[PDB]
Amino acid sequence: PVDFTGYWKMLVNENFEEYLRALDVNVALRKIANLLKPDKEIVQDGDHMIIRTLSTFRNYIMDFQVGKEFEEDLTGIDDRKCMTTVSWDGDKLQCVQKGEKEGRGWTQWIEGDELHLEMRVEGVVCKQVFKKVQHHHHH
Ligand SMILES: Cc1ccc(C2(c3noc(CN(C)Cc4cccs4)n3)CCCC2)cc1
């Protein structure tokens, strides 16, 4: 069993530039984005998951049902759309983003007070780790 509900601050962000490059994000935006240390605010409500990734540049909000494919609008990220399914894999969330890019998806899990997020596309891997925090941030 796992519950992702909480507020989470970025601790480390490894290889994000190459991940965005593999999504063809242009270099001007990669410059802005690799400086960001976004927070995540997550509510897990049954199998209804809301993940709000919050930064000073752009936010990205996910709101989906685990196990249920949906049309994911990535306009503000890499100017694409995917048919995405996030599924349980034991206590991990395994996301497959079907679309133009091969091998696109991510895996999210918890280890103690760390939220782990591995993002993948075209064989390129970015790893982020967040720490659970308690001072709450108005947005
Ligand atoms: C050009 C550009 C690049 C990144 C981003 C953000 C970004 N940072 O990473 C990704 C890829 N994914 C959307 C992250 C996930 C959220 C939930 C599961 S995976 N976008 C920074 C914080 C949110 C948006 C916005 C815009």
User: What are the distances in angstroms from CA 139 to CA 10, 35, 51, 121, 136?
Assistant: 17, 20, 14, 30, 10
On whether residue 1 sits in a domain, the answer given is no
Task: For residue 119, give every residue at least 6 positions away whose Cβ sits within 8 Å of its Cβ, in sequence order, or none.
Answer: 19, 105, 106, 125, 126, 127, 128
What is the CA(60)–ligand 1 centre distance, in A?
Answer: 6
Cβ of 16: how many Cβ atoms within 10 Å? Answer: 16
Cα distance between residue 90 and residue 26, in whole Å: 36
The 3-class secondary structure across the chain, one letter per residue, is CCCCCEEEEEEEEECHHHHHHHCCCCHHHHHHHCCCCCEEEEEEECCEEEEEEECCCCCEEEEEECCCCEEEEEHHHHCEEEEEEEEEECCEEEEEEECCCCCCEEEEEEECCEEEEEEEECCEEEEEEEEEECCCCCC
Neighbours of 14 (CB within 10 A): 12
Please count the structural domains in the chain: 1
Residue 136 belongs to a domain: no
Pocket perturbation via mutation, ligand 1, pick of 77, 93, 121, 125 by most ligand atoms within 8 A of CB = 77
Query: Where in the sequence is the domain holding 104, given as residue range(s)?
Result: 6-131
Q: Is residue 21 part of a domain?
A: yes
The resolution, in angstroms to one decimal, equals 1.1
Within a domain: 137: no
Distance 20 CA to ligand 1 centre (A): 9
